Short mmCIF file of C-alpha atoms and ligand atoms in Angstrom, two decimals:
data_model
loop_
_atom_site.label_atom_id
_atom_site.label_comp_id
_atom_site.label_asym_id
_atom_site.label_seq_id
_atom_site.Cartn_x
_atom_site.Cartn_y
_atom_site.Cartn_z
CA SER A 1 -163.33 88.84 -68.61
CA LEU A 2 -162.20 88.46 -65.00
CA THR A 3 -160.46 91.57 -63.82
CA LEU A 4 -158.96 93.56 -60.64
CA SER A 5 -161.13 96.60 -60.77
CA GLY A 6 -161.31 98.31 -57.41
CA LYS A 7 -158.77 95.92 -56.11
CA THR A 8 -155.84 97.04 -54.09
CA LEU A 9 -152.08 95.12 -54.67
CA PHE A 10 -149.36 95.58 -52.45
CA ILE A 11 -146.20 94.85 -54.55
CA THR A 12 -142.82 94.58 -53.26
CA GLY A 13 -139.91 95.46 -55.78
CA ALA A 14 -141.78 96.85 -58.44
CA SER A 15 -139.98 99.30 -59.28
CA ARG A 16 -138.96 97.27 -62.54
CA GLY A 17 -138.75 93.73 -63.86
CA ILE A 18 -141.41 91.26 -63.52
CA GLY A 19 -142.81 93.77 -60.20
CA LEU A 20 -143.39 95.96 -62.44
CA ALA A 21 -144.83 93.99 -65.39
CA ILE A 22 -147.66 92.72 -62.67
CA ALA A 23 -148.35 95.91 -61.60
CA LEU A 24 -149.28 97.33 -64.89
CA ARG A 25 -151.17 94.36 -66.02
CA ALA A 26 -153.30 95.06 -62.88
CA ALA A 27 -153.22 98.67 -63.69
CA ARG A 28 -154.62 98.03 -67.00
CA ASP A 29 -157.85 96.77 -65.18
CA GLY A 30 -158.24 99.82 -62.88
CA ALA A 31 -156.60 98.30 -60.10
CA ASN A 32 -155.09 100.40 -57.07
CA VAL A 33 -151.24 99.44 -57.08
CA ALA A 34 -148.85 100.20 -53.99
CA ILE A 35 -145.01 99.64 -55.16
CA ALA A 36 -143.39 99.13 -52.16
CA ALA A 37 -139.60 99.10 -53.00
CA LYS A 38 -136.08 100.65 -52.17
CA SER A 39 -135.41 102.34 -55.10
CA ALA A 40 -136.47 106.06 -54.59
CA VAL A 41 -133.95 108.42 -56.30
CA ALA A 42 -133.42 107.94 -59.93
CA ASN A 43 -130.38 106.03 -60.67
CA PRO A 44 -128.80 105.80 -64.48
CA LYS A 45 -126.94 102.54 -63.45
CA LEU A 46 -130.36 100.50 -62.52
CA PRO A 47 -133.15 102.44 -64.04
CA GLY A 48 -136.61 102.52 -62.58
CA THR A 49 -137.73 103.75 -59.36
CA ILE A 50 -141.13 103.62 -57.10
CA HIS A 51 -141.98 107.00 -58.75
CA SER A 52 -141.68 105.93 -62.34
CA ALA A 53 -143.27 102.80 -61.37
CA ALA A 54 -146.14 104.55 -60.14
CA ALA A 55 -146.63 106.84 -63.00
CA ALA A 56 -146.28 103.84 -65.43
CA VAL A 57 -149.60 102.25 -63.40
CA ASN A 58 -151.58 105.59 -63.44
CA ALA A 59 -150.41 105.95 -67.46
CA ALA A 60 -151.58 101.84 -67.92
CA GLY A 61 -155.20 102.87 -66.64
CA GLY A 62 -154.60 102.18 -62.49
CA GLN A 63 -154.12 104.27 -59.54
CA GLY A 64 -150.28 104.29 -58.48
CA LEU A 65 -148.67 104.89 -54.86
CA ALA A 66 -145.11 105.20 -54.60
CA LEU A 67 -143.71 103.62 -51.09
CA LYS A 68 -139.90 104.02 -50.02
CA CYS A 69 -139.94 100.65 -48.42
CA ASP A 70 -136.57 98.48 -47.86
CA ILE A 71 -138.21 95.49 -46.95
CA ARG A 72 -135.39 94.34 -45.07
CA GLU A 73 -136.66 96.82 -42.40
CA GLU A 74 -139.58 95.95 -40.57
CA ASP A 75 -140.56 99.64 -39.59
CA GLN A 76 -140.46 100.54 -43.45
CA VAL A 77 -142.87 97.35 -44.42
CA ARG A 78 -145.14 98.39 -41.39
CA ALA A 79 -145.19 102.40 -42.90
CA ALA A 80 -145.87 101.53 -46.29
CA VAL A 81 -148.78 98.96 -45.44
CA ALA A 82 -150.41 101.60 -42.93
CA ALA A 83 -150.14 104.50 -46.26
CA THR A 84 -151.44 101.71 -48.56
CA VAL A 85 -154.85 101.19 -46.18
CA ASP A 86 -155.04 105.01 -45.42
CA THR A 87 -154.59 105.80 -49.29
CA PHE A 88 -157.11 102.84 -50.33
CA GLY A 89 -159.13 101.50 -47.67
CA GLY A 90 -157.56 98.19 -47.64
CA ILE A 91 -155.32 95.68 -48.95
CA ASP A 92 -156.67 92.89 -51.38
CA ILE A 93 -153.58 91.04 -52.81
CA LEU A 94 -149.64 90.87 -51.64
CA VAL A 95 -147.26 90.07 -54.32
CA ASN A 96 -144.21 89.17 -52.96
CA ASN A 97 -141.83 89.82 -55.95
CA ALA A 98 -138.34 91.15 -54.11
CA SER A 99 -135.64 88.87 -54.71
CA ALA A 100 -132.01 89.07 -54.49
CA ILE A 101 -129.92 86.45 -56.76
CA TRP A 102 -126.09 85.13 -56.63
CA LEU A 103 -125.43 81.57 -58.27
CA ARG A 104 -121.90 81.01 -56.64
CA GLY A 105 -120.72 78.28 -53.92
CA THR A 106 -120.45 78.66 -50.42
CA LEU A 107 -116.53 80.12 -50.25
CA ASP A 108 -117.38 82.58 -53.18
CA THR A 109 -120.70 83.88 -51.26
CA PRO A 110 -119.55 86.85 -48.94
CA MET A 111 -121.70 87.02 -45.77
CA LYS A 112 -122.93 90.51 -46.96
CA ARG A 113 -124.26 88.81 -50.11
CA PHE A 114 -125.72 85.95 -48.46
CA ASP A 115 -127.84 88.22 -45.83
CA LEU A 116 -128.79 90.12 -48.77
CA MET A 117 -130.71 87.13 -50.01
CA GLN A 118 -132.02 85.90 -46.91
CA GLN A 119 -133.21 89.31 -45.49
CA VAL A 120 -134.60 90.21 -49.33
CA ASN A 121 -136.09 86.91 -50.28
CA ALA A 122 -137.39 84.61 -47.30
CA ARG A 123 -137.69 87.13 -44.71
CA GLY A 124 -138.79 89.59 -46.77
CA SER A 125 -141.96 87.36 -47.66
CA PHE A 126 -142.40 86.83 -43.97
CA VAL A 127 -142.39 90.02 -42.73
CA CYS A 128 -144.55 91.51 -45.38
CA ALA A 129 -147.01 88.87 -45.13
CA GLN A 130 -147.23 89.52 -41.28
CA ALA A 131 -148.02 93.03 -42.13
CA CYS A 132 -150.60 92.64 -45.01
CA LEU A 133 -152.32 89.79 -43.06
CA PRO A 134 -154.84 91.63 -40.63
CA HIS A 135 -155.84 93.74 -43.53
CA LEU A 136 -156.04 90.91 -46.00
CA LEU A 137 -158.13 88.78 -43.39
CA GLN A 138 -160.81 91.68 -43.97
CA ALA A 139 -160.90 91.39 -47.58
CA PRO A 140 -163.48 89.79 -49.74
CA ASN A 141 -161.07 87.59 -51.81
CA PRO A 142 -157.53 87.96 -50.42
CA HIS A 143 -154.35 86.77 -52.08
CA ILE A 144 -151.09 86.23 -51.26
CA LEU A 145 -148.90 85.49 -54.17
CA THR A 146 -145.10 84.95 -53.84
CA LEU A 147 -142.98 84.36 -56.61
CA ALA A 148 -141.00 81.24 -55.67
CA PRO A 149 -140.59 77.96 -56.94
CA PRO A 150 -142.16 74.31 -55.81
CA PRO A 151 -140.41 73.65 -52.65
CA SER A 152 -137.68 70.88 -53.23
CA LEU A 153 -135.19 68.97 -51.52
CA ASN A 154 -133.17 67.96 -54.67
CA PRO A 155 -129.61 68.08 -53.39
CA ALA A 156 -127.72 69.03 -56.66
CA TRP A 157 -129.93 72.36 -56.60
CA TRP A 158 -129.02 72.75 -52.93
CA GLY A 159 -125.32 72.24 -53.60
CA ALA A 160 -125.06 74.45 -56.59
CA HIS A 161 -125.50 77.67 -54.80
CA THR A 162 -126.53 77.00 -51.18
CA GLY A 163 -126.77 80.63 -49.97
CA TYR A 164 -129.41 81.14 -52.99
CA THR A 165 -131.12 78.42 -52.72
CA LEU A 166 -131.95 78.77 -48.89
CA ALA A 167 -133.15 82.16 -49.85
CA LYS A 168 -135.34 81.59 -52.80
CA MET A 169 -136.70 78.00 -51.26
CA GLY A 170 -136.76 80.32 -48.23
CA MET A 171 -139.70 82.15 -50.00
CA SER A 172 -141.38 78.73 -50.97
CA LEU A 173 -141.46 77.31 -47.75
CA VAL A 174 -142.52 80.46 -46.00
CA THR A 175 -145.39 80.42 -48.75
CA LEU A 176 -145.97 76.68 -47.24
CA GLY A 177 -145.99 77.39 -43.64
CA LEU A 178 -148.42 80.82 -44.15
CA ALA A 179 -150.60 78.87 -46.49
CA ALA A 180 -150.83 75.76 -43.80
CA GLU A 181 -151.58 78.70 -41.19
CA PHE A 182 -153.90 80.93 -42.78
CA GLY A 183 -155.00 79.26 -46.24
CA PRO A 184 -158.11 77.74 -44.19
CA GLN A 185 -158.85 81.30 -42.99
CA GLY A 186 -159.84 82.16 -46.47
CA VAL A 187 -156.25 83.57 -47.77
CA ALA A 188 -155.10 82.43 -51.17
CA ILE A 189 -151.60 82.06 -50.32
CA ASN A 190 -149.52 80.70 -53.27
CA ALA A 191 -146.43 80.25 -55.48
CA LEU A 192 -145.71 81.51 -59.13
CA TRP A 193 -142.72 80.58 -60.91
CA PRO A 194 -141.56 80.74 -64.40
CA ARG A 195 -140.65 77.63 -66.55
CA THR A 196 -137.84 79.36 -68.62
CA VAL A 197 -135.37 82.40 -67.80
CA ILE A 198 -137.15 85.87 -68.05
CA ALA A 199 -135.09 88.48 -69.05
CA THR A 200 -134.92 91.41 -66.73
CA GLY A 201 -123.52 84.36 -69.01
CA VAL A 202 -127.27 84.47 -69.66
CA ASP A 203 -128.31 85.68 -72.96
CA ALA A 204 -131.54 87.40 -72.81
CA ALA A 205 -132.39 86.17 -76.42
CA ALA A 206 -132.81 82.88 -74.91
CA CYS A 207 -135.56 84.44 -72.55
CA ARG A 208 -138.97 85.11 -72.16
CA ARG A 209 -140.24 88.66 -71.32
CA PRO A 210 -141.84 89.41 -68.04
CA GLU A 211 -145.20 90.28 -69.42
CA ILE A 212 -145.61 86.22 -69.44
CA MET A 213 -145.42 86.31 -65.51
CA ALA A 214 -147.80 89.31 -65.40
CA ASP A 215 -150.32 87.56 -67.39
CA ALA A 216 -150.11 84.38 -65.22
CA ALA A 217 -150.21 86.37 -61.92
CA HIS A 218 -153.63 88.15 -63.39
CA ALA A 219 -154.84 84.58 -63.85
CA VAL A 220 -154.15 83.54 -60.42
CA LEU A 221 -155.16 86.55 -58.65
CA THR A 222 -158.75 86.81 -60.14
CA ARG A 223 -159.45 83.18 -59.08
CA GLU A 224 -161.83 82.81 -55.88
CA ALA A 225 -159.29 82.51 -53.07
CA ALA A 226 -161.42 80.56 -50.66
CA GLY A 227 -160.00 76.68 -50.88
CA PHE A 228 -157.29 77.94 -53.04
CA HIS A 229 -153.85 77.67 -51.24
CA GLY A 230 -150.51 75.99 -50.67
CA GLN A 231 -150.10 75.66 -54.41
CA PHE A 232 -146.87 76.21 -56.43
CA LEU A 233 -147.66 76.93 -59.68
CA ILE A 234 -145.90 77.54 -63.26
CA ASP A 235 -146.60 80.37 -65.92
CA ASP A 236 -147.08 78.16 -68.86
CA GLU A 237 -149.47 75.86 -66.92
CA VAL A 238 -151.15 78.67 -65.43
CA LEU A 239 -152.05 80.61 -68.58
CA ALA A 240 -153.23 77.00 -70.53
CA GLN A 241 -155.82 76.53 -68.06
CA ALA A 242 -156.86 80.62 -68.58
CA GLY A 243 -156.95 79.92 -72.30
CA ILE A 244 -153.81 81.49 -73.29
CA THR A 245 -152.23 78.57 -75.26
CA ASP A 246 -149.98 80.38 -77.68
CA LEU A 247 -146.78 81.60 -75.77
CA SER A 248 -144.81 82.31 -78.89
CA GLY A 249 -145.26 86.07 -78.37
CA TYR A 250 -143.50 85.98 -74.90
CA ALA A 251 -140.01 85.18 -76.70
CA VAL A 252 -137.44 87.55 -76.68
CA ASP A 253 -136.46 85.83 -79.81
CA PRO A 254 -138.90 83.09 -80.98
CA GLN A 255 -135.88 81.25 -82.95
CA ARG A 256 -133.99 80.40 -79.61
CA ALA A 257 -133.93 77.33 -77.29
CA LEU A 258 -135.31 78.70 -74.03
CA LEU A 259 -133.32 78.91 -71.14
CA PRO A 260 -135.01 76.38 -68.60
CA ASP A 261 -135.59 78.39 -65.40
CA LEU A 262 -133.61 77.35 -62.08
CA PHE A 263 -135.75 74.85 -59.65
CA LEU A 264 -137.88 73.13 -62.40
CA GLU A 265 -137.19 69.34 -63.19
CA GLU A 266 -137.24 68.92 -67.05
CA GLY A 267 -139.62 66.12 -68.19
CA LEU B 1 -111.96 54.64 -33.16
CA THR B 2 -110.76 57.98 -31.12
CA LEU B 3 -111.16 61.64 -31.04
CA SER B 4 -107.64 61.96 -29.39
CA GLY B 5 -105.58 64.78 -31.03
CA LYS B 6 -108.66 65.90 -33.02
CA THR B 7 -109.57 69.43 -32.68
CA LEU B 8 -113.45 70.21 -32.18
CA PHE B 9 -115.05 73.57 -32.88
CA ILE B 10 -118.27 73.33 -31.17
CA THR B 11 -120.69 76.37 -31.00
CA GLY B 12 -123.02 76.78 -27.83
CA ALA B 13 -121.10 74.27 -26.03
CA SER B 14 -121.21 76.40 -22.33
CA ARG B 15 -123.98 73.98 -21.28
CA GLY B 16 -126.71 71.32 -22.84
CA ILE B 17 -126.00 69.38 -25.49
CA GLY B 18 -122.64 71.24 -27.06
CA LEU B 19 -121.20 70.84 -23.69
CA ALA B 20 -122.00 67.13 -23.21
CA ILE B 21 -120.55 66.50 -26.72
CA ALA B 22 -117.54 68.71 -25.68
CA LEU B 23 -116.97 66.51 -22.80
CA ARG B 24 -117.43 63.12 -24.59
CA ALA B 25 -114.67 64.12 -26.84
CA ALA B 26 -112.37 65.68 -24.52
CA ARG B 27 -112.49 61.86 -22.53
CA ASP B 28 -110.73 60.63 -25.80
CA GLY B 29 -108.29 63.64 -25.27
CA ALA B 30 -109.76 65.89 -27.87
CA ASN B 31 -108.88 69.86 -28.60
CA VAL B 32 -112.25 71.35 -28.13
CA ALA B 33 -112.87 75.12 -28.79
CA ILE B 34 -115.93 76.31 -26.93
CA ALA B 35 -117.00 79.00 -28.69
CA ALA B 36 -119.93 80.67 -27.16
CA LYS B 37 -121.33 84.07 -26.01
CA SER B 38 -121.49 83.82 -22.26
CA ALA B 39 -118.11 84.43 -20.19
CA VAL B 40 -119.55 85.22 -16.84
CA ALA B 41 -122.19 83.21 -15.09
CA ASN B 42 -125.94 84.53 -14.04
CA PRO B 43 -128.20 82.42 -11.81
CA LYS B 44 -130.83 81.56 -14.43
CA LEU B 45 -128.62 79.68 -17.12
CA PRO B 46 -125.32 78.47 -15.65
CA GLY B 47 -122.37 77.59 -17.70
CA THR B 48 -119.71 79.83 -19.40
CA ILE B 49 -117.17 79.29 -22.19
CA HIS B 50 -114.72 79.07 -19.04
CA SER B 51 -116.56 76.58 -16.96
CA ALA B 52 -116.69 74.55 -20.31
CA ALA B 53 -113.09 74.94 -21.12
CA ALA B 54 -112.20 73.64 -17.30
CA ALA B 55 -114.57 71.06 -17.44
CA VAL B 56 -112.77 69.69 -20.89
CA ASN B 57 -109.87 69.69 -19.19
CA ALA B 58 -110.82 68.01 -16.22
CA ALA B 59 -112.35 65.12 -18.40
CA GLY B 60 -108.99 64.38 -20.38
CA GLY B 61 -109.05 67.09 -22.98
CA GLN B 62 -107.77 70.58 -24.02
CA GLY B 63 -110.54 73.17 -23.83
CA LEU B 64 -110.16 76.57 -25.52
CA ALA B 65 -112.69 79.17 -24.38
CA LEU B 66 -113.51 81.37 -27.16
CA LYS B 67 -115.96 84.41 -26.46
CA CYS B 68 -118.06 84.03 -29.64
CA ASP B 69 -121.55 85.16 -30.65
CA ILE B 70 -122.21 83.34 -33.90
CA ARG B 71 -124.52 86.01 -35.00
CA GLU B 72 -121.02 88.00 -35.43
CA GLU B 73 -119.39 86.71 -38.69
CA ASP B 74 -116.00 88.78 -37.24
CA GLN B 75 -116.42 87.21 -34.11
CA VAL B 76 -116.73 83.59 -36.03
CA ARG B 77 -113.71 84.32 -37.73
CA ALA B 78 -111.77 85.33 -35.02
CA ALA B 79 -112.68 82.38 -33.09
CA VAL B 80 -111.72 79.97 -36.10
CA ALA B 81 -108.24 81.81 -36.34
CA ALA B 82 -107.83 81.71 -32.76
CA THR B 83 -108.59 77.79 -32.81
CA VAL B 84 -105.91 76.86 -35.56
CA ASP B 85 -102.92 79.18 -33.89
CA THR B 86 -103.74 77.41 -30.64
CA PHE B 87 -104.00 73.58 -32.17
CA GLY B 88 -102.73 73.74 -35.61
CA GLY B 89 -105.98 72.89 -37.47
CA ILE B 90 -109.88 72.22 -37.28
CA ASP B 91 -110.80 68.51 -37.59
CA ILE B 92 -114.36 68.66 -36.54
CA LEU B 93 -117.26 71.75 -36.47
CA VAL B 94 -120.67 70.65 -34.46
CA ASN B 95 -123.08 73.16 -35.28
CA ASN B 96 -125.27 73.33 -31.82
CA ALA B 97 -127.82 75.95 -31.73
CA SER B 98 -130.62 76.82 -29.50
CA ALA B 99 -133.26 79.54 -30.45
CA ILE B 100 -136.95 78.04 -30.62
CA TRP B 101 -139.97 80.00 -30.70
CA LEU B 102 -143.32 77.82 -30.86
CA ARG B 103 -145.99 80.39 -31.95
CA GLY B 104 -147.74 81.32 -35.11
CA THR B 105 -146.87 83.98 -37.66
CA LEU B 106 -148.85 86.99 -35.94
CA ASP B 107 -147.31 85.77 -32.70
CA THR B 108 -143.41 86.07 -33.85
CA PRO B 109 -141.87 89.38 -33.50
CA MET B 110 -139.46 90.14 -36.15
CA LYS B 111 -136.53 90.22 -33.32
CA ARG B 112 -137.67 86.75 -32.18
CA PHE B 113 -137.54 85.53 -36.29
CA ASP B 114 -134.24 87.24 -36.85
CA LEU B 115 -132.56 85.45 -33.38
CA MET B 116 -133.70 82.31 -34.96
CA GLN B 117 -132.29 82.81 -38.37
CA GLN B 118 -129.06 84.06 -37.34
CA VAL B 119 -128.24 81.73 -34.52
CA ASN B 120 -129.76 78.43 -35.92
CA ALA B 121 -129.26 78.48 -40.43
CA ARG B 122 -126.76 81.65 -40.53
CA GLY B 123 -124.78 80.36 -38.02
CA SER B 124 -124.45 77.06 -39.28
CA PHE B 125 -123.64 78.64 -42.54
CA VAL B 126 -120.93 81.16 -41.40
CA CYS B 127 -119.10 78.38 -39.14
CA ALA B 128 -119.05 76.09 -42.08
CA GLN B 129 -117.59 78.59 -44.44
CA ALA B 130 -114.92 79.92 -41.82
CA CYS B 131 -113.91 76.09 -40.93
CA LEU B 132 -113.91 74.55 -44.61
CA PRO B 133 -110.57 76.14 -45.31
CA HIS B 134 -109.13 74.11 -42.47
CA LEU B 135 -111.60 70.99 -42.75
CA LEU B 136 -110.31 70.61 -46.59
CA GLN B 137 -106.90 69.99 -45.35
CA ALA B 138 -107.70 67.69 -42.44
CA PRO B 139 -106.98 63.63 -42.17
CA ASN B 140 -110.98 63.27 -41.17
CA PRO B 141 -112.82 66.27 -41.65
CA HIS B 142 -116.70 66.34 -40.09
CA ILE B 143 -119.49 68.99 -40.24
CA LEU B 144 -122.04 67.69 -37.91
CA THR B 145 -125.19 69.73 -37.35
CA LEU B 146 -127.49 69.51 -34.87
CA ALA B 147 -130.84 69.63 -37.12
CA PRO B 148 -133.38 67.12 -38.38
CA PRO B 149 -133.94 65.28 -41.76
CA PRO B 150 -135.56 68.03 -44.11
CA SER B 151 -139.28 67.68 -44.56
CA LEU B 152 -141.98 69.56 -46.34
CA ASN B 153 -144.68 68.21 -44.22
CA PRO B 154 -147.29 71.17 -44.26
CA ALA B 155 -148.30 70.89 -40.68
CA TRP B 156 -144.59 71.42 -39.12
CA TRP B 157 -144.17 74.53 -41.32
CA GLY B 158 -147.67 75.95 -40.28
CA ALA B 159 -147.22 75.26 -36.65
CA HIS B 160 -144.81 77.69 -36.32
CA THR B 161 -143.34 78.91 -39.50
CA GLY B 162 -140.50 81.31 -38.32
CA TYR B 163 -138.99 78.78 -35.84
CA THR B 164 -139.50 75.90 -38.79
CA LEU B 165 -137.80 78.00 -41.26
CA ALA B 166 -135.02 78.87 -38.76
CA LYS B 167 -134.29 74.52 -37.70
CA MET B 168 -134.96 73.09 -41.31
CA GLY B 169 -132.82 76.02 -42.61
CA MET B 170 -129.65 74.08 -40.75
CA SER B 171 -130.84 70.84 -42.17
CA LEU B 172 -130.88 72.89 -45.71
CA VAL B 173 -127.64 74.54 -45.55
CA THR B 174 -126.37 70.80 -44.09
CA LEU B 175 -127.93 69.37 -47.58
CA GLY B 176 -126.47 72.03 -49.90
CA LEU B 177 -122.80 72.13 -47.86
CA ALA B 178 -123.03 67.85 -48.35
CA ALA B 179 -123.64 68.39 -52.01
CA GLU B 180 -120.99 70.81 -52.55
CA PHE B 181 -118.01 69.66 -50.20
CA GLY B 182 -118.72 66.14 -49.51
CA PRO B 183 -117.35 65.12 -52.99
CA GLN B 184 -113.93 66.47 -51.65
CA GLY B 185 -114.09 63.96 -48.60
CA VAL B 186 -115.76 66.19 -45.76
CA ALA B 187 -118.17 64.11 -43.81
CA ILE B 188 -120.92 66.95 -43.76
CA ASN B 189 -123.94 65.04 -41.82
CA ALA B 190 -126.93 66.04 -39.45
CA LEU B 191 -127.86 64.47 -35.89
CA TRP B 192 -131.23 64.56 -34.14
CA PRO B 193 -132.75 63.17 -31.19
CA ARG B 194 -135.69 60.66 -31.68
CA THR B 195 -136.92 62.31 -28.58
CA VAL B 196 -137.10 65.96 -26.42
CA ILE B 197 -133.77 66.29 -24.82
CA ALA B 198 -133.88 67.90 -21.29
CA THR B 199 -131.96 71.39 -21.56
CA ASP B 200 -133.06 74.97 -20.49
CA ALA B 201 -134.53 75.14 -23.90
CA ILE B 202 -137.63 72.88 -23.17
CA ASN B 203 -138.50 76.21 -21.39
CA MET B 204 -139.61 76.83 -24.74
CA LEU B 205 -141.77 73.90 -24.98
CA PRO B 206 -144.88 74.48 -23.20
CA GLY B 207 -145.96 71.38 -20.51
CA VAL B 208 -142.41 69.77 -21.13
CA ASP B 209 -141.03 68.05 -17.96
CA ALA B 210 -137.51 67.32 -17.99
CA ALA B 211 -138.55 63.67 -16.33
CA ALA B 212 -140.23 63.11 -19.68
CA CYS B 213 -136.88 63.65 -21.70
CA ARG B 214 -133.65 61.90 -22.28
CA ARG B 215 -130.28 63.20 -21.12
CA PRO B 216 -127.75 65.21 -23.59
CA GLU B 217 -125.45 62.03 -22.88
CA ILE B 218 -127.47 60.50 -25.70
CA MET B 219 -126.52 62.97 -28.17
CA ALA B 220 -122.85 63.21 -27.12
CA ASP B 221 -122.64 59.49 -27.70
CA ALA B 222 -124.23 59.51 -30.91
CA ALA B 223 -122.39 62.20 -31.79
CA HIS B 224 -118.66 60.05 -30.79
CA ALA B 225 -120.26 57.56 -32.87
CA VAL B 226 -120.62 59.38 -36.27
CA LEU B 227 -117.31 61.71 -35.55
CA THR B 228 -114.96 58.72 -35.18
CA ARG B 229 -116.46 57.36 -38.38
CA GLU B 230 -114.32 57.46 -41.77
CA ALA B 231 -115.09 61.00 -43.25
CA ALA B 232 -114.64 59.97 -47.33
CA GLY B 233 -117.94 58.83 -48.52
CA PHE B 234 -120.14 59.60 -45.40
CA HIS B 235 -121.95 62.85 -46.45
CA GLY B 236 -125.50 63.98 -46.84
CA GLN B 237 -127.08 62.05 -43.94
CA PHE B 238 -129.87 62.84 -41.85
CA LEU B 239 -129.12 60.81 -38.55
CA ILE B 240 -130.92 60.03 -35.54
CA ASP B 241 -129.28 59.44 -32.06
CA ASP B 242 -131.04 56.08 -31.38
CA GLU B 243 -130.26 54.77 -34.89
CA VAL B 244 -126.43 55.82 -34.92
CA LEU B 245 -126.15 54.05 -31.40
CA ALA B 246 -128.00 50.73 -32.58
CA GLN B 247 -125.45 50.60 -35.47
CA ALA B 248 -122.60 51.48 -32.84
CA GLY B 249 -123.69 48.26 -30.80
CA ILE B 250 -125.29 50.15 -28.02
CA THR B 251 -129.23 49.12 -28.34
CA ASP B 252 -129.98 49.85 -24.23
CA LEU B 253 -130.95 53.22 -24.05
CA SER B 254 -132.59 52.65 -20.61
CA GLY B 255 -129.50 54.90 -18.95
CA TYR B 256 -130.10 57.93 -21.23
CA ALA B 257 -133.70 58.46 -19.83
CA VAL B 258 -134.06 61.43 -17.13
CA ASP B 259 -136.53 59.45 -15.09
CA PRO B 260 -137.37 55.98 -16.17
CA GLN B 261 -140.70 56.54 -14.56
CA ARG B 262 -142.19 58.95 -17.24
CA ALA B 263 -142.81 57.70 -21.06
CA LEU B 264 -140.36 59.67 -23.27
CA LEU B 265 -141.89 62.66 -25.06
CA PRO B 266 -141.24 62.26 -29.06
CA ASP B 267 -138.70 65.12 -30.27
CA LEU B 268 -139.88 68.03 -32.64
CA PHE B 269 -139.61 67.18 -36.41
CA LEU B 270 -139.64 63.57 -36.29
CA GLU B 271 -142.61 61.53 -38.05
CA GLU B 272 -143.81 59.14 -35.67
CA1 LIG C 1 -123.70 78.01 -59.10
#
């Protein structure tokens, strides 16, 4: 089987949710995982920290590094990348997972909220790519994997929540540009997005668990990077190609019709 | 088709395209709020909110000089409030903005990335947000953003990702705003020049001589043609100056050339 043994992953926002799931799937292989996230001090209101994540990585079979990194701050990103290189010797894989969401219209989106989304999503992916690339370019099989949808100019999607669509498609379009620039230099710069809503008026019973994205990420990240860039991939399709065709186990409640994810057309 | 008595809020209109738009509207008797950062002049990049407001007055309009850095939400809100207190409303918002940096990602410092996102995409969003409550009450409301048609062309994204994100961001904000508010009868559209336009910003375009450009007045005149259209049923369009002017019966564009002895340079972000 393909493995991330010996590889070093820098994963943003991986104190919880999809980032943590991806971290743990890589850890199972013996990967080094740098958890770069803002949450350091334990808060019951939003459980999970860089430190709990690093411990979970260690318990899952990997080597965890907890890095206090508010990715809105370039200096913290730079410091976290240097720490990762100092601890593990390099960076093989960047996963741009950190994301903030808010589905209201423009008159109902305070600039504080708009700014949080732009800074964490599109800007966070850009600055992390910028900081990691010098090290990625020296690795044997470098990946940047951004958790973002295929780019779209669908006016309905844009009008539905312009602030969030700007920030999330921003991640997609940063991926598009990075892939165009650096893909030809051997870096696999791609995106991965879930078919359904992931449980991390939206009902978790109509969702899938984050392990679908962890397993899909694994399938992408173990691919040869040379010649593999600018792709916008979906979890179910990735897993099918990898030989995982029975997705029933990923369902929170397998008797429920699944909620479709934002930013994918339904055929 | 006149802008007489209409109130325009134009960002960055101390010089260049914004100023030209301001003066074309002034000629009709429009009220123009000049929302820009420069209050006092410097040798390098002339024009201030005060010279622009004075020029609007000289041209036949009513100018209002507003010291406004559009990076600052509080200043934008303050400027919009002052405009309403001065003229009674806002009929037209023109999102005009200049922050360019044509380099690759490793050569695009975060300070420059941030300047671009803040002035371009964010600036358009925050000004739209602040003006919309007033636009929605106006007889013939427009938002006109000076931005290109949205494109997913990978070459354009790869060439200078930070800048493309920022400027396409203005287009994408327009796309979303039009989808949300267009149905309420707000004419939310974009306008982009076929060619490069001669302004201070050509300094950020290596090799580009003003002589191979068009004058800002082509954008001023195309803007006027857009802004005097009925707003109902006219949203989500990404318009080009030459095409707008052709529809308006202006097909001879030769007078808009800076220098007829030079071939015109095609603009960024348009397929040839
Ligand atoms: Ca919505």
